[PDB]
Amino acid sequence: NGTCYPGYFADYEELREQLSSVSSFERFEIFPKESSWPNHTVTGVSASCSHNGKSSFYRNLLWLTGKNGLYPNLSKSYANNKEKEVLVLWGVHHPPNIGDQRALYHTENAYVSVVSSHYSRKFTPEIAKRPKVRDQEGRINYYWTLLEPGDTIIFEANGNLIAPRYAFALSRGFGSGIITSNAPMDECDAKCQTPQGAINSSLPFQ
């Protein structure tokens, strides 16, 4: 269970390297669902992300769609008043045909712009026919950034945006990592851990 909707994750190994040194975080709602997008619809689900037999979507992201037949411009901003680094994630949708794009966003030339104090990028959708991965011919690309304390981040779009919904305030520490293992979890206490088992010893070699 990774990305239920097929797509490309940018700088995935760098994100793993960053998360290897985090000991705790705080998950907070950066853009509340019920009060941030009055002009748009915020109820969009896919059959490739099904939960309990019914189609659903991610929990930290939001799928915006045009309301009343219009998709007006959106511009949102957030300032980091948390005395900590904030990890922000978003996405961009690439539909499989021009008819789907016109039905979904009511435009043919769409742009997404994400700008920070030391970060800036622009995205444009690409429409093409692709082999189906999880019964889908479209794609979604995922992006992330780290926001310093006292900084501001701005999103501008007129279509194809998968908006952030939750963010994390990171706290760092030494002596952590990510390991892959098949061993079961027990109730013991030790000073050394390996992918095969724990070690209770003071010998100089192993």
Binding site: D11, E13, E14, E17, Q18, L146
Partner: protein, 52 residues
């Protein structure tokens, strides 16, 4: 120097530097410790040979 999206290369550079430093410190200390005993044994053997 590395930018923010180059943490793995920075970690590899640090690992290489630390490993080489550890190895050379170990080598120097072990060499000095091992030669110090042989010198004293050499002197004792010389005195014994002169007496004999």
């Amino acid at each position: 120097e590395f930018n923010k999206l180059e943490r793995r290369m920075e970690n590899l550079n640090k690992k290489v530097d630390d490993g080489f430093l550890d190895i050379w410190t170990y080598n120097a200390e072990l060499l000095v410790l091992l030669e110090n005993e042989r010198t004293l044994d050499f002197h004792d053997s010389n005195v014994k040979n002169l007496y004999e």
